[PDB]
Structure 1
Amino acid sequence: SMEQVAMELRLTELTRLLRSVLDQLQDKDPARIFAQPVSLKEVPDYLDHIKHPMDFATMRKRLEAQGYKNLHEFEEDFDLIIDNCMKYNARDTVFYRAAVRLRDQGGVVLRQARREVDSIG
């Protein structure tokens, strides 16, 4: 149908916008602490601690399969990155601190992304 195509164009355009959001968020992680999944070879107990691991590469795979239907789903995944880190790692670590800085800086980007998603529809 033509309606299915129109819906698919909206999804493609959301995907375009979330790709730009993802790039901007990942620039706020210049140490690349959150770039890749936590290694289960190097942290073998990780899944005993963290039930839903997340990282920027995993988000990018979902994004490119157009697997985020709305901004809420994308934000859920970004929040997992931060929240998992702040539980696994103690307050006095470079990892925890990187997450705090990513959260604070990403808030600005996400605030305007929400306005853009509503605005453009």
Structure 2
Amino acid sequence: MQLTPFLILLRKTLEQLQEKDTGNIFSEPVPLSEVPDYLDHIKKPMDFFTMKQNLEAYRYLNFDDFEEDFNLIVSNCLKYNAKDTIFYRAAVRLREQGGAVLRQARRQAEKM
């Protein structure tokens, strides 16, 4: 398996995941200026912009590690936010819609 087609697939998949985040609440790191206690509870923050940086820094050489950082976006949000919030429901919706995107992308990868 050659590296450039795989990275092309991951770039497309990250764009498709970002599209499911129609509110753009997962596109950038959670702003500590507004949420100063965020790092007290969340030990590995993650967001789609950071994922894009990691992608280009070759830190995703297999689908599992890509999907792991996507799962962090979801679990950080379920963890920090109360169940009755918009943020929490948005993470539940991203988990569902994002899982479908990831499953189709993984089959594409498995064909390479």
Instruction: Establish whether TM, by shorter chain, passes 0.5.
Output: yes
Equivalent residue number for residue 42 of structure 1 = 34
Q: Deviations over 1:40-60 (max 9, x none)?
A: 111111111000000000001
Report SS of the residue matched to 1:102: helix
How far 1:67 moved relative to its partner?
Answer: 2.2
Report SS of the residue matched to 1:43: coil
5 Å-filtered alignment, 1:10-25, equals 10-25=2-17
In the alignment, structure 2 segments of 5+ residues that lack a partner are none
CA distance in 1, matches of 2:55, 2:32: 24
5 Å-filtered alignment, 1:75-86, equals 75-86=67-78
CA distance in 2, matches of 1:103, 1:74: 14
Aligned length: 112
5 Å-filtered alignment, 1:1-121, equals 10-120=2-112
CA distance in 2, matches of 1:68, 1:31: 26
CA distance in 1, matches of 2:17, 2:24: 11
Q: Is the 8 A contact 1:28 1:102 kept in 2?
A: yes
CA distance in 2, matches of 1:59, 1:106: 14
Report SS of the residue matched to 2:18: helix
CA distance in 2, matches of 1:107, 1:44: 30
How far 1:65 moved relative to its partner?
Answer: 2.4
In the alignment, structure 1 segments of 5+ residues that lack a partner are 1-6
Q: Is the 8 A contact 1:50 1:84 kept in 2?
A: yes
Q: Which amino acid aligns with 1:20?
A: K
Report SS of the residue matched to 2:74: helix
Amino-acid identity (%): 64
CA distance in 2, matches of 1:91, 1:29: 18
CA distance in 2, matches of 1:11, 1:45: 39
